[PDB]
Ligand SMILES: O=c1ccn([C@@H]2O[C@H](COP(=O)(O)OP(=O)(O)O)[C@@H](O)[C@H]2O)c(=O)[nH]1
Ligand SMILES: O=c1ccn([C@@H]2O[C@H](COP(=O)(O)OP(=O)(O)O)[C@@H](O)[C@H]2O)c(=O)[nH]1
Ligand SMILES: Nc1ccn([C@H]2C[C@H](O)[C@@H](CO)O2)c(=O)n1
Ligand SMILES: Nc1ccn([C@H]2C[C@H](O)[C@@H](CO)O2)c(=O)n1
Ligand SMILES: [Ca+2]
């Protein structure tokens with residue numbers, strides 16, 4: 178009954194910044210941010226920092242946790258909200274086919290880890306995930322260079338060392354999935370999901386009238 | 400509606416051997432073996448072998464996988480007269496015996512151990528309330544015995560297991576199933592009947608007594 182929209186985008190693209198501008202843009206819009214605050218405080222340890230420090234060792238662990246939390250956080254919000262619209266920061270899909278995938282392709286996860294990961298991911302969704310099916314997706318598109326700026330801009334520490342190559346790898350992944358719609362999944366229905374693509378290479382912190390304009394148009398057809 | 404019994408015991412104690420002697424003693428008794436096969440075959444790689452080879456690196460991974468599978472396997476057999484279902488080990492022995500000991504042994508750090516438990520709690524809380532045990536059968540054997548039967552079985556990944564390891568596991572079993580002093584987050588547990596059987600002696604062909612006590616146990620459930 179509640180429309181479910183997923184906001185996707187490369188690291189530091191503008192998801193959070195954008196997602197906020199919407200939180201208030203209308204009382205009938207709730208947001209489900211990425212539970213990052215929860216991955217950076219696991220028993221006074223930063224697991225995001227641990228992956229970025231030794232990916233060959235922590236990727237699997239980290240990726241697995243990230244996804245688990247993401248689900249719980251989203252399953253969560255689905256209780257506590259006329260024209261209901263729920264906005265997710267990233268989604269289980271981008272978790273597996275963008276980050277997890279890329280980590281494997283980059284040898285940061287071996288056959289065993291990657292195999293387990295997917296089986297687990299499939300099980301999870303098949304289980305506590307049916308009700309998390311998206312009705313739409315908003316691709317906040319930005320070049321690898323721009324996102325790199327915003328990471329440096331945001332100032333989060335674990336990310337300050339991220340190489341443009343990483344950015345690049347994930348930018349292509351994003352594109353193939355959201356823009357071109359070439360990358361396939363195990364979730365058949367994503368093949369019929371609307372995908373609004375917004376170019377946010379330019380600052381929109383105070384120039385989003387257009388963006389928010391297109392968002393409404395998008396949602397009306399849902 | 401289906402009675403759920405869990406067979407617990409140290410490595411190579413006799414769980415499988417015992418659990419079989421039962422599946423064929425009443426078309427009303429089904430068994431849910433420990434998916435130890437599915438572990439040894441993950442994309443042509445043995446994850447059990449990977450943990451025993453470098454625990455500091457694979458324990459968490461392995462432990463996590465093991466429990467996931469165990470649950471799926473049990474949830475499965477759950478669906479499909481005086482129905483009794485026998486589980487080889489249980490999510491409880493997974494966490495408070497093996498996972499726990501791996502942490503206590505520095506094979507899992509604070510981060511891994513923390514994540515493990517939170518996940519474990521979430522899992523059970525979720526797709527688990529239907530896996531609650533009605534009873535437990537503790538197949539008790541000294542680590543000495545378990546160590547010999549590890550040779551007799553011949554599984555490779557285990558041939559290098561040290562007695563002290565076998566010992567540490569034994570005490571975790573003793574604490575939770577005999578002296579009942581090890582507490583969990585599942586309050587119901589310490590309120591579940593616990594039949595303890597001494598299997599230090601070979602029962603492959605002398606189980607009349609064992610199976611006798613099993614029936615007595617189940618009648619009071
Ligand atoms: O139009 C914009 C979009 C982003 N940012 C900066 O980029 C950083 C990361 O943006 P965000 O928090 O949205 O990251 P994301 O949620 O996309 O990972 C923040 O410090 C923002 O101030 C900015 O200055 N202008
Ligand atoms: O009464 C018995 C119980 C066990 N075993 C041997 O102990 C090993 C381990 O048995 P099992 O596979 O049941 O171990 P578990 O699955 O309980 O760890 C095998 O070689 C069994 O044949 C035996 O010789 N006699
Ligand atoms: N499955 C995911 C999801 C997010 N992140 C990262 C990207 C950022 O560095 C941080 C915040 O999104 O987490 C990741 O590596 N893997
Ligand atoms: N949580 C568990 C469960 C089982 N095993 C191991 C012990 C034996 O080597 C094999 C069969 O029980 O699996 C383990 O290390 N950790
Ligand atoms: Ca902290």
Ligand SMILES: [Mg+2]
Pocket residue numbers: 192193211266
């Ligand atoms: Mg963010």
Ligand SMILES: [Mg+2]
Pocket residue numbers: 414415433435487
């Ligand atoms: Mg066995």
